[PDB]
Amino acid sequence: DIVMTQAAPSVPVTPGESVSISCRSSKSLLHSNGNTYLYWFLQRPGQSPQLLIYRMSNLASGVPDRFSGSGSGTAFTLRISRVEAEDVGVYYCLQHLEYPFTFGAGTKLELKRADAAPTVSIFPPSSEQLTSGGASVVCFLNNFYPKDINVKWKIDGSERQNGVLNSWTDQDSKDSTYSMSSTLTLTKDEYERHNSYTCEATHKTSTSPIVKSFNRNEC
């Protein structure tokens, strides 16, 4: 089989600067008909791959002129002249000269933007959930940079570690930030035995904690 090598799993770039992504083939992709049989695609989280370049150097309809493709018969380069937030995702090369068709392993773009403080919101359990015997408290920490962040839960002033599950988004396609959700799941009986609930974060944008709280009975 033709081996397609994208040797970098990830490449960092500062927004507004240029980037070059490399792909190499084990044999020439030049067809007897004169065309070079090499595609580039961009894949965003949860989506099907989007065509960027066909026949090695032709820009696809709808793709901005910031994108270009070039190469010899075995070394290929996708260039973005000025990187924008919408360009984040995973880039793949594909040869279609010979069966079986083969892809390179993918290269993620990491956009190294400026620091940004999180916007924090806390949510008491839904009344509908309480009827089922459970009580989940949710905290969102949104649009921050860099990715590293701590959260701590406190109940009546005491740290609670058990029952917490966290999830992080990929970089935002408009502002290159990260977001995080933290969920503390209790039984209804446990939730009703306490009154103050606090989501406390730390991030490099502040030298003190970033805190949101509520009292269960304060409605």
Binding site: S48, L51, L94, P100, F123, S126, N142, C219
Partner: protein, 212 residues
Amino acid sequence: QVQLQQPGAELVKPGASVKLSCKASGYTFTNYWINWVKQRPGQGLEWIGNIYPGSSYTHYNEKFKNKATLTVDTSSSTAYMQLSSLTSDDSAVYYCANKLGWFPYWGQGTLVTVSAAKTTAPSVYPLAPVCSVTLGCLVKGYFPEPVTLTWNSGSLSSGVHTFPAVLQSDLYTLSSSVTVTSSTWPSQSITCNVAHPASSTKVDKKIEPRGP
């Protein structure tokens, strides 16, 4: 407009077979190649094989020769891929794609989950603020993946963060937030919509201000 329609999910018992469908529209189905591609979660793309629907002429990647079988129905303009004797290594998204000259078009992919666990529809909970403004939606206790979560049936898309699901005890949980101008809510209507393809369910929950 060229379109390829695939189901969102198939739950398959270990050792069983599954048949994946890909319904074509917007062009002459018999006249262009259909390709199939595998993608394991968090990993890269792998080519399985292709078929020319007018003739059923096929090519297979050697790696899949004993796993995949490609066929077509030219009456309904549908392409099919049968996968045999499934193992956990077969859990993945499977895409169909076509080729019209230089230009490929892709389906949305079917997520195949190989498991003995039963399908379970999610409980969906609206999250109003403590007594800009941010609202939430909690989707708890479902199996398999995926769901499709929208706000206002997809018309509210800016300022949304929908988080990856977390698995515990053979059940998934996912959340989403949406952030709007404070003059927007609760003056105007905001609803979370959740579709779970494996259970054929769709639920709507309007976000309402908390009472006393």
